[PDB]
Amino acid sequence: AGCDDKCGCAVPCPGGTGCRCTSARSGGAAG
Ligand SMILES: [Cd+2]
Ligand SMILES: [Cd+2]
């Protein structure tokens, strides 16, 4: 939910398109 580079999300994470916390292969669990 908190997103950093360890989240596998965008940095900073823009909430929408850069938020691969869903359908995520990079990372989403507790991210
Ligand atoms: Cd994110
Ligand atoms: Cd995330």
UniProtKB/Swiss-Prot annotation:
It comes from the Eukaryota. Induction: By abscisic acid (ABA). Binds 5 molecules of zinc. May have a role in Zn(2+) homeostasis during embryogenesis. Belongs to the metallothionein superfamily. Type 15 family. This is EC protein I/II. It comes from Triticum aestivum.
